[PDB]
Point group: D3
Chain length 147, copies 6
């Protein structure tokens, strides 16, 4: 359980508003280990697969186009309960319901521009990780402290 | 439009005296709200009693006005989607002991009589407080750049 | 005297070794509590504080903070005892992962605070001073 | 009287647009200077040409006034010992590429035409800038509790 | 054209291990530079020997390569006016003891053998280092909204 | 060899404490990589302060300096690291805060030379004198951190 991994993606608005370092800092100071990190403009096919459970939803077409309008930071973090805690750190889906102290609570307002994505479960994490990262891009090392 | 709601935020004299003006403003800037009005003044007793007119019959009303008059305040107007209620969440609760960490009052103050900040509790009180503290000429209009990334 | 309530906060070795001492003290200063005691030591015979090896393996920063409801609010600022339910914005919510390797301790109650303060601090180490912003904190 | 020196500090439109108002204010508050005046406005073209009258024959003067008029600015007056000279040191240099890390311009901007902030370069120019931008009632007098620990 | 200059910035393994990645990135974001490339990897010894090829005859070369290979590094490309020279200024000096407070090396490290960050020293070095560490398809290309307020 | 075990004495003056800057100052030394060795909180007596500032006893500001340093509690610290004495002074700034640059403690947080919030040993000689004056040897704690492997080669 100490080696659980989650997928975190900084959406284009978050990149455009200069929030990459702030977001990464919150995961670092929390104690989670950085495993994968890349910067890319996600293709429309990749995004449709990423949000496949929401294709019939009314906001899907605009969601895929907005996630394609700019580059994203794709990340993998490792640690105990990182999936659930990552979701807690992110906030709620609607930033209006995200508490102060959370990433979405502190830094954004509207649900269509909520700066960050996080996996909802281990099953979604393993699917998102293998979708966004090849296995050789995931680094394994012993981060300090921890123990 | 919904993305044009406005609220009134005031940094109370204890928040100014303790050097919290920048910290408070920064929270509204980084959240994505747009600064519309900003002034710095020592509010008169008449202005404060009209501001707190719904509390005229509370036992703490006289002490409230005297403390709000004991020093300068920062009066502000912030604009954005749901800015009134979201502003209240960012401030915390009336009693800072009920304000959770991460809120302005939860992080920076202790006692209900010195809660450093005020925020409009409703849209109707907001426009009432805005017009009370600001003239229409003092409210600035500008399209910031990141609104394409703040709103759809 | 209401505003004169005191609590005992201890930074455990993981907090010290991860460089969080100043960050933790800052959260109490910016909140408005008054620093009363502050010392640095490797603790032995910790069998009185608890009712032991990890607290003896390294250094502990022991503090005494004063203010209205400092015991209750101090525990709010630390976060829940498990870091998995601790909210972002709290000390444990921001910096802590698991329960065993905890970074910080805070007094459970006023009665516990009085006991822990008397055990860890001599009376000569508790400094009384009037801070300037305390009349802007209290009514 | 030396501890009562005042300077004029203005956050330019790019500074407001990029959300640096609270950050800039925080640096002056944490330094120990006293906030005296604070207002938010879109400066008229006459006010800006008067503000930059010593540069009217420069090739960039026209673009400077237009850019300064392109958005709202935050006008400020700060008080303290050597606040004019120290204010310039905290801002950095005219070209952000010459501004050192730790200063406002060094930390936050890149090119001279977009250097987010203005500060008076002398007591004389500060006196003129403060009168040009502020009315006398907009300057607030108060004693902060910090001053006994800031000045001997 | 000048505003499209690019530099290579690497966070060294000690910087990654001490939890400084976000701090370092934030200094480049808040300054106004545009992130162009970003990757996380454990660099091979041959990559590291080519990167520091001008130092192959230095007595510390073997220890430098081993240390740079002992953990994963964060590789980055940043774009902006004078980003190469300004990146050096933000980094500090080779010896952290000569790096001023406010710089990355001056704030965050102590020993020359563990100075947490690398940055290109020249435009020629940056072009060599960028193509050494990145492939062209990894260099992302976009119009940051916050760019009409950074550049004239 | 033991160059990384050099120690300095840093004291947060009463104005630094009263203005709520204790956490800010400690953080700068922590994030730099220096190791906290000693830490205490006390209202230093006049006899202690006069010994601490003995080289200044004939200066015009000596009596005011001792009185102000006694008017409230100070945070006394010992920090350890390579060249921590000289580097600590750089992190502090100059005697006059008006000559202290942004990014330094005195440059960011204070204004006047008489209220410069912090003290730091000006030499290795001064440091061992100041450390023993304010601290007994059993108050100096020993530990090694995970970061030491990444701060020093
Ligand atoms: N009502 C909506 N309008 C526009 N976009 C939405 C709406 N609801 C969700 N989205 C977008 O779809 C993304 C995925 O939503 P979902 O997976 O249900 O929540 P979460 O973001 O917590 O995983 C969100 O990040 C958001 O940007
Ligand atoms: N019991 C009390 N004693 C002293 N002051 C109080 C008390 N209750 C409220 N106040 C002050 O009156 C102000 C207005 O009260 P109210 O509008 O009910 O709270 P809020 O400001 O959270 O909306 C508060 O900001 C607080 O500073
Ligand atoms: N060569 C230039 N190109 C574009 N803008 C300039 C140039 N020189 C100065 N400016 C702008 O005009 C303002 C006033 O210039 P000056 O008073 O000399 O600098 P400072 O504001 O640092 O005192 C500057 O802050 C800068 O924004
Ligand atoms: N004297 C030295 N001893 C050990 N390592 C060194 C020494 N000089 C340089 N290095 C290492 O080699 C790297 C490259 O050296 P150089 O290119 O001269 O410095 P810079 O990184 O400042 O451009 C440095 O960042 C440092 O980590
Ligand atoms: N001219 C002065 N007036 C008042 N106090 C002073 C003056 N010069 C120095 N002091 C105080 O005495 C302390 C010791 O001075 P000194 O050791 O020479 O400087 P530093 O503290 O930078 O080493 C200073 O930190 C300062 O607080």
């Amino acid at each position: 359980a100490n080696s659980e991994r989650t997928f975190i993606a900084i959406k284009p608005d978050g990149v455009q508003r200069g929030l990459v370092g702030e977001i990464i800092k919150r995961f670092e100071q929390k104690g989670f280990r950085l495993v994968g990190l890349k910067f890319l403009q996600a293709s429309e096919d990749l995004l449709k697969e990423h949000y496949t459970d929401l294709k019939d939803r009314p906001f899907f077409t605009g969601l895929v186009k907005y996630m394609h309008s700019g580059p994203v930071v794709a990340m993998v973090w490792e640690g105990l309960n990182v999936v659930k805690t990552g979701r807690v750190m992110l906030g709620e889906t609607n930033p209006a319901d995200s508490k102060p102290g959370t990433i979405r609570g502190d830094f954004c307002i509207q649900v269509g521009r909520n700066i960050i994505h996080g996996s909802d479960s281990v099953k979604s994490a393993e699917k998102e990780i293998s979708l966004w990262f090849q296995p050789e891009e995931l680094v394994e090392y012993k981060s300090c402290a921890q123990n």
